[PDB]
Structures are given as structure tokens and as C-alpha cells.
Amino acid sequence: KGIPKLDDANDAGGRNSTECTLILTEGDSAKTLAVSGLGVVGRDKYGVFPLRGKILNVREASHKQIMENAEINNIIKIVGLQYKKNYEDEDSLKTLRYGKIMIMTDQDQDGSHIKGLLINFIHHNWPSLLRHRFLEEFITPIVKVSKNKQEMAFYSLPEFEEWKSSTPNHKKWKVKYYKGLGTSTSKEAKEYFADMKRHRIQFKYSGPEDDAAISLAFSKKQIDDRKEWLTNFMEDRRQRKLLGLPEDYLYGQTTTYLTYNDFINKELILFSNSDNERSIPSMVDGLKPGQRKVLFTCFKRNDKREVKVAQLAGSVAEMSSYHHGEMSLMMTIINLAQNFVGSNNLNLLQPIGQFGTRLHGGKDSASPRYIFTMLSSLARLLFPPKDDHTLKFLYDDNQRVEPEWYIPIIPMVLINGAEGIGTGWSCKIPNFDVREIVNNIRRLMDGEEPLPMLPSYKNFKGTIEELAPNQYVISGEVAILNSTTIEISELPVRTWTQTYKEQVLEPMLNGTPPLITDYREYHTDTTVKFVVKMTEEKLAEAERVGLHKVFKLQTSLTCNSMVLFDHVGCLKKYDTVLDILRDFFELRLKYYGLRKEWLLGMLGAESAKLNNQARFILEKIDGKIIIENKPKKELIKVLIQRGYDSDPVKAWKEAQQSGPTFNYLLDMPLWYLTKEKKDELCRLRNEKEQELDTLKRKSPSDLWKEDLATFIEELEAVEAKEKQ
Template identity: 50%
Template sequence: GNKPTRLMGILKLEDAHLAGTSESIDCTLFLTEGDSVKAVVVSGLEKIGYDKNGVFPLGRKLLNVRVATSEQIAKNLEVNNLMKILGLEYGKKYDTVEDLKSLRYGRLVIMTDPDPDGAQFKGLIINFLHYNWPSLLRLPFLQQFVIPIVKATKGIGELAESLTFYSLDEFEQWKTQTENWRHYHIKHYKGLETLRKEEVKECFSNLQRHQIDFRHGGDDDDRAISMAFNNKHLEEWRYRLNVWKNACKDLRQLGFSGDLYAKDIKEVSYHDFVKKDLIRFRNMEYVRSVPSIMDGFNERQRKTLYTCIKRDYKEEINVAQLAVSVAENCAYYQPDLLIGTITGLAQDFVGSNNINLLIPNGQFASRHLESKDVGSPDYIFTMMSKITRKIFHPRDDPLLKYRTDGNQSIEPEYFAPIIPMVLVNGANGIGTGFKTKIPKQNPREIIENLKRMLNGEKPNPMDPWFKGYRGTVERIDQLNFVISGELAVLSPTTIEITELPVDVPTENYKKSVLEKLLCGSEECPPIITDYQEHHTDNNVRFVVTMTEKMMQQVESEGFHRAFKLQSVYSLRSMLLYDSNGSLKTYNSVDDIMNEFYEVRLELYRKRRDYFSGKVEALRARLVNQNNFLTEISSKVLIVDSEKFDVLLEELRRRNYAPDPLIAWEKK
């Protein structure tokens, strides 16, 4: 069809002047990840002009059209806007460069931050084009814009020496080859917004370096794109993710990061993009949602505890300030997302934590609204509970493997609590095509079972347990349990509900069950005549009335069934990171207990060796000091007139070892 030369009604589009004309094949659309990145491009367009260059920000990530319904796609604003701007048509094939002349733009450049979210943004656009017009990806149509991730500067003004690096591999190699690299000012670029205006203009003055072609090399590229966005391939994704993580560990041991965008790279295949760049987002998605078997934490929870330990807050701090502190100490750039994590660690209502590691001073939500009634983060306060450092013992701190972000040391790969906190407080996580649900257990039963294991005995079976819960938990089979609320008959027309299934908020139950039983529907007449609420902070109490005839009918059907007071709890989705950092599905609570036990026992051995080594180093230091003082007092060693270098040489000659404690710490 005819391509429009001017588009109306698309907010935030800065259209190229020649888009949709006979010269549209030479026009480039910069598609950005949000408004802030658009502002960066606008600064760059001052250098190259608007005649053949346009920019459009997507307000959010594009829909995954491969799994969406036709109705969802038709109603999606981002999809419709992108099609209009580019001039794409469903059902039309774009097999040759000549076919590109029918589009409003002959080239699409994706501009994102060099982080996992940016990789997902690029991937969803590739998926959109590949699903509808696969042949378009075989043409020189799609590019990505890359920026330096590290800049090293020495000197000031016109005489300053400046070096830019597009991968951590390049940067680390330069550091090993440059003895005085510490004399340089090192700046890490976390995103496009980090660039100053003059740096943006420098980038747009050398587009050939910054615009990287996507290259289609054959069936492997098609399979990689399809696998990445088709939920049928989730197990393959997990396998590849574990392989990738292990490969990254090996590369780090060799001093390389495994970055895709190496020096002077001009093009990237879709296969390599999926397997080396997009996989970072999938990894981040799992890291954000799936806890470690060792400490029961996801990434944000671990960062929060690390900050509380590092800063050693002696007094309470409001949640908003703690979120900022976590962001500063752990290189986390979205402090707003930490609010829910912090409040979650402090909550102590029924069904939340069996052991809350932070203290809730203020309104940290209740069971009645399931965390929706939490107070403003500026007005609620918290601090570490006294029990936290009993569980996460300080003597384990030197044994932990701490991660780094640039030059900053941040949280460990995992903490090492003395009991498996992943079973104490359980876990719930969900992401693209996966979920994990770990049952909460009784800490006393866990401790008793650990003692049994230390004595060579098998652990006793454990059923889910929730602190303060007054309902019942009954085992159906090895993987399923029924959780039942409590109900009592007070009179021939009155019943009392004093407990709900543990995962059902009071307010939700009232709206979804009692109000429907009161009002009825076309299929089902009203069952109850009224209900009253008499709840406390932690306890539920509904008093429900009905006719005697309806009471008899409900009793014959079963009170728990009629009032929906039972739910099934399954152990079929126990996905965790194991002690080696690989994703693993566990089949039973015993499997989790056994792995935790073996790793924790080995850590106790390492702790013993660590502190016995430290004591021995202190002993050797004291022996040195005693010998030194003895030789001075007996005038065997005279130090008054000796110069330091001469004295040092004399001590070496007399077989004094260098400070044993410093030598041990370095070792």
C-alpha cells in the first residue's frame, strides 16, 4: 500500500523528515527504551540531523507476540504504533532490499542500556519481527547501538588521555598490561543516561563504531529466537542457563568476563545474541525470583541483609532510608523495588515469616489484606532482629564469597545460616514460564532433624507449618497437603469461622466467598442471611447466620466445602539455586535438607580450620614478640642506634619471620 509521509496521533514520535518519501530507504529510526533514552538520542540528532533520522520511545517492553492471543496483539498500543511508524503490513513478505523501499524507514536501530533489561528489550523486538516477517531479519535492516561500559581518563583539559572500553574483557586486559592504571580515573557507564551531552555527540559523530549489525546466518538463528520466546522450551533454557553460568565462572577464573561486544566488533548473529546476551536477562529474572538453597534469599533479600550487617544499625531506620542504603552499598539501581523486599523480611503476621529477620516497627501489613495495607516507607521503621546474627553467625563472614560490581565489593554469592532458612520461611517466586514454591516448616522440627542427621539417623518427615496458624495441615501423599480452616456450629442457625486457608487474605475471602453466599446468583440462590466480622490483628472471626433448613443442607454437603475453607498445597514446584549456583528442581523437603546439611557441615570444617589457623598465626606473632623482647633485655639485640633497614636485615638473619598474622591473612 501507499506509505504515509506524515503520521498523526503517535505521541512522542520524532519522525524523520524524509520518512515515507522516495528516500525512506535511507532513513533510520532509533527505537529507544523509554523517554530518558529518547532524550539522549535527541542530543545526538543535533549532530546528524532529522532529515533521515527519527526517534521513538517505547513506553514499556514490547508484547511477546509468540505466546500472545490475536486479541491481545490487536489491542496492544506498542505493536500498533511500531507497525505504523515502520510501515509494516501483516502478510506481506520482505525478501529483498527492494522490498524495504515500501517501508517508511529502511533501517531500525535499537537503543537500550547495556544491562539485562536492555537485552530483553532488544530480544522482544527481534521476536516481533521474526514471528511476523522472518525474512526481514535476513536483510540489512536491524541494528543495535552500543556504548562504552568503562572509560579511563588521565589528566585534564586538552592534554587528557582518554581510553574507552566496550567490554569488561578489554578493560581487564588493559589493567593487567598497564602498571599505573590506578592513576587513571575509572568511570563505569551503567546506561545511556550516564553519558554527558558531549559524549553523546561523540558517539553520534562515529556511528560506524556504535551501530552493530544483527546478522542472520541460517537455521541456527531461527531456532535460537524461537527457543528464547516459546514457553515450550523452558527446560532447554534452564539447561543452557546452567551451562552459561558455569562457563562464566571458568572465564572469570581466567580473567575474562565473556562479554559479547568485544573490541571492533561489527556484527552479531542472532544465535550469539540469544545465547550470550539475552541469556543475561533470563538469568537476572531467575536471580530476582528464585532463592538459594543455602540462605533462602533471592538477590534483593540478600543485598538487604548484607547492608544491615555491614552498616550494623544500632537504632531503627525508616524503610525508605534503608532502601537507599542498600542501593548504595550493593550497587542496586532501583531502590524503589527494595521497599517490598524490606517490609517482607520484617512481616510477622500469620502466613508471612516463621522467623522475621527484621523488626517491624509500624504498620508492616496484616493477614487481612496480604501486604496491601503496609504503611508508607517514610513512616515505618525497622532494624535487625537479635536472632538474625545468631542464625547468620559472624564467624561465617570470612568464609563467604563476595561478589563485586566494578571496584565495589557487594553481597556474597550466598550466606550460610546455621539452619536452612529456605525451609523456615519458605519462598514464592514467579517469572516468564516458571514458578517456585517452597513450603514453610517448623524451625524446631528442622533443628531436631539436623541433630538426628549429625547422629547418623534419618530425618523425620515434616509437614508445612505456619507460626500462629490455628487451622490444620493434613498430608494427602508425598507431594500434596490439604490446609483447612476452622469452623464451629454455635446454634441451629449460626456458625463461627475462626480460621481460613493460610494463603487466603481475610478481605479476599469476604468478597469472593461470603458476599457471594449472601447475595447469590442466577445459578445459585443465597445460602446465608448475614455475617458479622470480629477480627483482631492476627485472628479471624466471622459469625455467619442462615436458616435452619439451609444449615441442614450445608451440613449434608460439608461445611468446609460449602464455605471454601480448604486449599491444596503442592510441593511440585520447588525450584532453587543449588550450592554451586545452578538451577535445580528438588523433589522433596528431604532433598533440600540433605544438600544443605552436607554444605553446612563442610563450612563448619572450614570455619574450624580458618580460626585455628588464625590462632596459630597469633601464637607465632607472640613468640616473635617474646623472642624480640628477650633478646633486647639480654642485650643480644641492640636497636637504639640501628637504622630501620639495618635492624630489619638483622632480624631476618636471626630467623624472625615476617608478621605471621599478616602473612596468614594474605594466604
């Protein structure tokens, strides 16, 4: 009736107005899918309107924000809803243009969140409408299987997994994952609406417990409630896993009604947990799942030259089975690369291009399609390649992907800090000096006491003092030049240059009466320098009061919510950063033991293989073995009867979960019969034998010291080049 992107129903606003249905979809792509499915007949009774992502939570939202929201204003106009109107009587429902609203989103956790926000909107503004079976949802499959011309659909991952357990020949079926509504074709869309019984679920009001559930999820007043709520979920799911029990799921059979209580505690709770899993980092590598996928990809690619952020994002997506919008990966990549004051002490990705500055706090970054990046030379030193063999890599989309966590040589979570916002919890950890952390590691390794650590930011000329535990004061730098002039040499951490000029200095220049007379900017892209001119009286006043206080060069930093995932996926709340450092130390020391154990096995096999290859060559030259014009099968019998071992590297690798293999012996070129290459082979076997023996007489701590030494050397070199 005057709104774009709207495919309004034809029978909307007549006698049969209550017999119409409005389909709210997850985006415009979803709108197209719904439209194709609903045709050709049914345009009269069914309407479609796309929602541009997640909508507004209006339960504690201000009056200004709610009225100035375009999304909900469109919905109100289309449906014909009226603000603060009671719909208890069956006559008030006749006023609306549509009878029922069917929410059709993705079959992912985010889709569930969208449904919840819509429900929250209706429940808060019109509680009467919710008790009249006004809301429903259109569900679409997420996994499909077919062997011949028969087809089966699943509507949840637990359902699909349970099917593979019951069905023996599950590998004889095609497997098609549905990332979203966009995956489904127009033809498949028609088949969906043809079987409306299966894909239609009606929301049912059962009592006050529903209101309690809805309020639980979307009230800012009930945060502690959601904490216990999710704590129970995490613990129970953990126990189900320990007892070897499958997760419960919905939409297994055809269901008519769905309680709001059940919806919140069986579907929406899945989102809130996944939100915490993707927003709150792990203590081990300080990475989130999204970030870790990027790092895993860059490690797998091993690019020697720069790569577009946009291009890299796509690579990460396909190689790490990333099932979200690529824009998020791009923003993550940019964030990981930033290295201005207040961001990262040790950026894992190189910011090659305009990734933002301290001027606008990174917001001045260029388009991801116009900037380049690659691994920092410190990345594979912080996360040594040798440790990859002791990690547990996840499986998704029929391929191996990122591990549950990487195991860096120093607690990375303390280096670039940690910021994240989920449901129930949120994480906030300040940055710390790398060299200082390395030192504390060495002290803990020497059985000494770890020194207390103050938050330290790279290239920050200011100071950071501690008052109460986990409560700090960050101060910039100011200096007196004369009776009328002062110099501001540093702003406090995360206090950006442009914002400071607009929010602090410009008010001081104008109007409360003016304080400063004039100011000049001498900023570089990495440093801050303000020169301020004042009267002699004004400066004398500010001097006794406190220059830092007057010019707002002090910011407070309270970090009590240091919430992280431990090495087993449990949400721990760490009290001090030394707790994090200690727990990390235990785990890291253990995995150095594990690395040595693995390396012993590998180097052992490799030495054994070299032993066989050397013996084979020498016996051939001595004439103890004839292979010229000899058949393969006969020659194999010869080797076995002469006691030659099967491929040790192959045999050892297979032990990490066709007859004997002697290919590695004959795969050797004719070169290794020459004198120069024979000596080289005998040299390599002795050298490799030596490496194994050298490793045996080294403690895990010794190996750790090696990595730390190698890291520090390059760290100095890198930061030196930075200063230059």
C-alpha cells in the first residue's frame, strides 16, 4: 500500500481478510524462494514480506528508537496493527489486513533468533494476539538424502546423525547440506508448499510459563537468569555426551502445535549457546571459531605473497566449512590485521593497505576488496607447525577443518586482549606486553614465582596504574610548555584522535564558558600531538585541579568479566590474568611432552626407513641383490626373505587411527648408486639417527625454551623494522 519490496496478498482487506496469511522471510533471497513456491495459485491467501536481518528488541527499547524503526513500521502498516490496542475480543482481529503471520527463516540457530525477536515484538506490544494462535512458522529441511529415485529429508543435524546410526548403508546415499533458504531451488520450493502439513508449525499459548520463557530470553532485567539458564544447558549437554546419549531435537515427526515455553528452551537456547561459542574466545589460543578458521586457512595456504581480504575470506569459507556470511569473515580478517595503538600488540595478519588508524579507531578502513593481507612472520612461530600433529581437528562438510583450539607457545589471549558479546556472558580482557609474558613463562618453567603484570599496550607512551584488583587507570601524557601553552603527547588507550577533537577540544573552544583559545594538530598516522593555547589564568587553574582531569586524559578500565572457554569447552570466569597464565602453562607444558612423544615416533620411523634404504643401496652395489630384469613378485619375495622391513613411515602413519610395501626402496633414483649420492644417503641416515638421539635427551621445557628463543629473536627483528 506504499511499501517497496512488498508482495501483498490480493484478498487482503476484504470480507475474507482473516483467511489470509503473511510470510515474513529471512532476507530478499528468501522472499524469492517463497514467491516461487506459492505460485501460481495462492497469491490471494498468502502474502510475502522480507525482513532485512535481525529486528529490534522492543522490550526495554526507548520510545525514540522504536518509533524510528523502519522494519517494524512496515510490518505494522502491512498487517494493519494498531499501537496499544486490545485484541481479546474476536472482533478486533477483523481490523487487521492479515489473519496469520508465518515466519519462514533458515534452519540455523540465527533463524531461531529471528523467530524469537518477532515473538518478543508481538508478545510485548500485543499479549492478547499471542493467545489466539496468530503466529506460525514455515520449516525447511537442512539435509537431504537419496540413493535411487527415493528422497528423504531431515530438519535438524541431530535428526540426520540419528538416521546414520539406525541406517547401516548411510554411505550409499547422496548428502546435500542446506546452508540456508537460498540453497533450495524454485522447483523444491513448490514441493515444499505442496506438503503444507509437514512444514507448518503453529505456535501455541499454554500459560504464564510461556510469558516467563519469552521474558527470560529478551529482557535486559533478566541477565542472571539467562546465565543459570545456559549454565544448565551446557552442563546437561556435556553429561549427555559423557553418557553417550544423542541430543534431543524437534520436528522429527509432523507436529501441529509448538509451545512458546518449548520453543525457548529447545530451539532458541541452541542459538544463545552457539552465540556464546562464537563470541567468547578460548583461553588456549585466544581465538574465536571464526578467527581460528581464518588462521587455519592461512596456515594451509601458506601464501608467500599478499592476498585480497575479500578473496581470502572466500578461501576460508570453502576450506574451513564456514557457514555464515563472508562479510563477517572479512571484518574478522581486518580486525586481526590491525596494529595501531589500542588494537593488537601482536597482529597475526599483516595489514597491507588501509586497515584503519588510531584516528577513527579502525573505522576508517578501506573496502575489503581493495586491501591485501598475509601471515605475519611471527604467526607460525607463535603457533609452531610441529604442534599441529597433537591437535584434534574437527570434521565438517565431509572434510577436515580447524582444530578445537591451537596451542601457542605463549598465552595469546593475554596478548591482543579479548573482547566478545554473547548471551548471558560477555568477555573483556586487556592487552599485555609480549616480552613480559614470555618472561613469566620462563619463571614458571624455572619453578619461580610469576611477577605481577600490568596491562601494557604497544607503542603507548602513557601510563597504566592499578587501584583495586582487576581495576586500572589509563592516563595519557600532557606537558607544560609555558604560561600559555601546553602539549598533549598521548591519549589514553582506545581514545581515538578524531573523537577526542570533537568531544573534548571543540567544546573547550566554544560553548559553559570557553576554556582554551586555540589549538593545532601535529598528528601522524601512529602518533598524537596536540598543542593548546590558553590564558595564564586558565592554565594556572587547570594546574592545581589536574591537567589530566581537566582535559579528560584519563580513562578507567574495569575487567571483572574475564570469561573464557577452557580446553574442554566449559565457560570459566577467571579472576586474575595470572590464573589464565598458570592454567595455560600446565596445558602447554603437557603438549610439549605430547609433541616430543609424536616426534620420537615420526623421527624413529623416518630413521628406520633411511636405514632400510641405505642397506638396500649398499647390498645392491656389493652385488648381494640382483634386480635387473627381475619380475616384481619374485623381487618382493627376495626382500621379505632378506628381512627388509615394510615402509616404516607408512606403517607408523597408519598406526595413528594390501600386503607389504617396499616401493620406497625402488622409488629411489639411479643416482643413489653413484658414489657422491651413496655417501649422501649414508650421511642422511646418520644425521637423521642423530636428530632422534638429540631429541630423546631433551625435556619438554628445553623444547619450549627453543621456540621462545626463536620467537623472541624474530620478534625483535619485526618490531625493529616497525620502528624504522
